[PDB]
Amino acid sequence: EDPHLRNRPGKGHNYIDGMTQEDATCKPVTYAGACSSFDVLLEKGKFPLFQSYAHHRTLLEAVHDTIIAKADPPSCDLQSAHGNPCMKEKLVMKTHCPNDYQSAHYLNNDGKMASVKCPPKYELTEDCNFCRQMTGASLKKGSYPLQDLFCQSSEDDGSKLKTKMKGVCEVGVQALKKCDGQLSTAHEVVPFAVFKNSKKVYLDKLDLKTEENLLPDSFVCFEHKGQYKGTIDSGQTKRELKSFDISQCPKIGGHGSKKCTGDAAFCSAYECTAQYANAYCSHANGSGIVQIQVSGVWKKPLCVGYERVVVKRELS
Numbered sequence: 001e002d003p004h005l006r007n008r009p010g011k012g013h014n015y016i017d018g019m020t021q022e023d024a025t026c027k028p029v030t031y032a033g034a035c036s037s038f039d040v041l042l043e044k045g046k047f048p049l050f051q052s053y054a055h056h057r058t059l060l061e062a063v064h065d066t067i068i069a070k071a072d073p074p075s076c077d078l079q080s081a082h083g084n085p086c087m088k089e090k091l092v093m094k095t096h097c098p099n100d101y102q103s104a105h106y107l108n109n110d111g112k113m114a115s116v117k118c119p120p121k122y123e124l125t126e127d128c129n130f131c132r133q134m135t136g137a138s139l140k141k142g143s144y145p146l147q148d149l150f151c152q153s154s155e156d157d158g159s160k161l162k163t164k165m166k167g168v169c170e171v172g173v174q175a176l177k178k179c180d181g182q183l184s185t186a187h188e189v190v191p192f193a194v195f196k197n198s199k200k201v202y203l204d205k206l207d208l209k210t211e212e213n214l215l216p217d218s219f220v221c222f223e224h225k226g227q228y229k230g231t232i233d234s235g236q237t238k239r240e241l242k243s244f245d246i247s248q249c250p251k252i253g254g255h256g257s258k259k260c261t262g263d264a265a266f267c268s269a270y271e272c273t274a275q276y277a278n279a280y281c282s283h284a285n286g287s288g289i290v291q292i293q294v295s296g297v298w299k300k301p302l303c304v305g306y307e308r309v310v311v312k313r314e315l316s
Helices: 048-052 059-064 084-091 264-269
Strands: 104-106 112-118 123-124 131-133 143-144 148-151 170-171 183-194 208-211 219-224 239-244 260-262 278-285 289-294 298-299 303-314
Touching: 048 264, 048 303, 059 084, 059 112, 059 143, 059 148, 084 131, 104 303, 143 289, 219 260, 260 264
Parallel strands: 104 143, 260 278
Antiparallel strands: 104 112, 123 131, 148 303, 170 303, 183 303, 208 289, 219 239, 219 278, 289 298
């Protein structure tokens, strides 16, 4: 995990649909290169959740791997007559966009991916609510991630599931009940999740558990880029590592187009050859099937995250 963060589960596609010019280095993300939609997820202290579950998918990876659908209108333009579809939802979130972003993206209350967006040569203001003429010569080429989040594949149905928080009148968009009285208001960093046929379900607590397993996404595989340097051996520095697709590796008593080796876990399911290996495969720390307890019950979510939103609570 430590040196294999840029070795992504699935495709590893970190770009937003209207924004191609950075694909040579974000489609896929890998050990080499920079990516303005992704490198930002790895500055420590920011994005702590995703950092802990780093070998699960980003939101952009979720959509390109068809786990998450794109919102009805994929992006909202702040400059217009208004730009209203996103606006309501965006204003309830408190966000800090760096300079030079034309886009920024988030899971909407509907569970789709929406983005907030400026016309060409216009950037997002520090709070991400407005567009203004750019001030360098360079716009970044990504979209900026607005929540702290990871995603996975799931078929566990959650249409029965819904936000409930104790004495909360409002959280983000969601009105939970009517509070006649005087309310305390604050921006809180609120955990949430979305499931198959659900909307965003905000939560009082985050209670997660993980089953580790030996499925393909629980490994990261690498090889030497370049001319032949001898065996591949879990050598981490002096690296010209590219990423490597584990499906090429033969399972025990199976066909495969390449030759492989790996750690003990790997050699328990896949065949291993130290000498002739094209690639070495490691087990990814903190990978697996995540479930979440939604007030009494364990369910397998599509995505889980944190979001800084306005919360109104009754007193007493």
